[PDB]
Amino acid sequence: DRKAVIKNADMSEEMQQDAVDCATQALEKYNIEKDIAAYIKKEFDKKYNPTWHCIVGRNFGSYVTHETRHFIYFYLGQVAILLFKSG
Amino acid sequence: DRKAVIKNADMSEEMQQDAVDCATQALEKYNIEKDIAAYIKKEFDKKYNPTWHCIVGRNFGSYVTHETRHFIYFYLGQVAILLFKSG
């Protein structure tokens, strides 16, 4: 299956694991990046309260402002995933 | 120069124009997507108050939750730019 590589995290270990799990479910179900992102965002809103934002892609850079302990940036296979709550 | 194509906006005309202008300045100065994004985010924080988030790239999808009237998604040349304030 897909290899998870966490690049930058400000987030508990448990929540990082839930992020990888949610992204793995999303990739199993969906092929389009915005749909993958939507699944992850919506699940995190339910599991860890709103308001989350998710970007999924192979080529992008970002500059965001996040709530402390609510940020992860990771690869699952070849796709990069940014998931965070705003500050 | 670069062609601006606004794909989806929830934002005043004036602010949409400032977004395109800021992105044009950013692309003139920087080549790396995260630096482009940082310039735009920081300028919008100053011009239109915090808190903005910016993604710049050629391949990504997103699912975010934004404040009403504070969202734009547009291309400048071949790069896509998402700029918004969180809800």
Binding site: G57, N59, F60, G61, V64, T65, E67, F71 | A38, G57
Partner: peptide
Amino acid sequence: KAIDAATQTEE
């Protein structure tokens, strides 16, 4: 408390 973060894909 809020923190700025930047990310950049490898590709």
